[PDB]
């Protein structure tokens, strides 16, 4: 089994730890952990292309999209590899993250190791929004916290 | 070419940006950038195995050592893949980093993407120090700053 880990940090109150586990090379990736300091509601949750934090989360670039697809939700065929949908925060400002995804990987051309995980200001509309930006970013707003996805023990 | 980047952060502030560039997978990696907030003298400079900064630089584990070798300097045949020797800080507290290395890579089994770059408290004795610790850590002492090595544009 392969494992990875990401420490989310930013300029404000948002911080988290996210774990990745892939039992088999061809298999789904379990994503789990916790994020604190979030407003109640949905927050866009994406793997962005670059593991570049030189200028904070802006340097991470666009959604990781090795197959040149449009933006969607994790359960859509038409999605970026990086499209992990939304995490949900309650009034406690905590999002408990528990995802299984078949499109990201910890090896090969879908590999997310060395790329950046970002949690966003607003909801990702999963490409179903009423504008052009829906099909590109999902209108999830600014980047609250991010980290480079690293190889774990 | 393949490129990677690492933001070093630690108490001080010890703060640096280190760039990696590899023209070809069978070629050397150029490593360059700047680190500020260091004491004058040599500081051990290593790639550690895990890109895990969960509990700070300690979570990164030992020197990256995929070939099960002993610790050495970058010029030694007998070294860990992660053994990049020392960076030198002047009285200005700045280390200007300019390294070329044939053993690290940005792809394959010696790939350092998703691992942690660490700058150390003391000099790495390059395995010539003559105690047991020399052949394992190089006696470079505590971890001042670290970051996960990410894929760059
Ligand atoms: Zn995003
Ligand atoms: Zn997307
Ligand atoms: Zn070593």
Author numbering:
A (entry chain F), B (entry chain A): 1 to 153
Sentences from the paper on this structure:
SOD1 is a homo-dimeric enzyme with copper and zinc centres responsible for regulating the level of toxic reactive oxygen species particularly in the cytoplasm. The destabilisation of the SOD1 dimer is a key driving force in fALS and sALS. Dimer dissociation is a critical aspect for SOD1 destabilisation, leading to the emergence of toxic aggregates in motor neurons. Extensive work has established that the pathogenic role of SOD1 in ALS arises from a ‘gain of toxicity’ that leads to the abnormal accumulation and inclusion formation in motor neurons of ALS patients.
Due to the different degree of response to drug dosage and disease progression from ALS-associated mutants between human (A4V) and mouse (G93A), we validated mode of action of ebselen-based compounds in mouse model’s mutant by solving co-crystalised structures of G93A SOD1. Moreover, modification of cys111 by the ebselen-based compounds does not influence the overall conformation of G93A SOD1 compared to the ligand-free structure with RMSD values of 0.16–0.25. In contrast, neither riluzole nor edaravone, the only approved drugs in clinical use globally, are found to be present in the structures obtained through co-crystallisation with these drugs.
